[PDB]
């Protein structure tokens, strides 16, 4: 997986990536901040409509999925898999609220990569 280009986690200035959250923190406190982006080298799935997504702290990480699909507005033939922290969620038994505080970093922003491959590793 020899990476070449920086990651939204690295590239974007942490402090800047932390502040951006502040807003959502002072605006959407009852929401879990996440950063969904195309996998480094993703040519399948289209470029998400947005990068920032406000997930409800009253659902399961799964929802976010059913939510993404809507965004990507893919067909029942298209394959889409949101990788949380770079790892699929084959097992979604945790709330986006926890999955966040269980993954997200001090920054306070989740980082997930979506693509048409959940077993590319």
């Amino acid at each position: 997986s020899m990476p070449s280009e920086k990651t939204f986690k690295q590239r974007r200035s942490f402090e800047q990536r932390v502040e951006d959250v502040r807003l959502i923190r002072e605006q959407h406190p009852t929401k879990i901040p996440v950063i969904i982006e195309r996998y480094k080298g993703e040519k399948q799935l289209p470029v998400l409509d947005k990068t920032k997504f406000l997930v409800p702290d009253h659902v399961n990480m799964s929802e976010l999925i059913k939510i993404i699909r809507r965004r990507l507005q893919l067909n029942a033939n298209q394959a889409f898999f949101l990788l949380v922290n770079g790892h699929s969620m084959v097992s979604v038994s945790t709330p986006i609220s926890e999955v966040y505080e269980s993954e997200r970093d001090e920054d306070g922003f989740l980082y997930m990569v979506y693509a048409s491959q959940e077993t590319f590793g």
Partner: peptide, 17 residues
């Protein structure tokens, strides 16, 4: 308007299939 990060996207499970 995208002249700032006023409000990100809304993840509503009501607009889902």
């Amino acid at each position: 308007m995208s002249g700032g990060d006023d409000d990100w996207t809304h993840l509503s499970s009501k607009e889902v299939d």
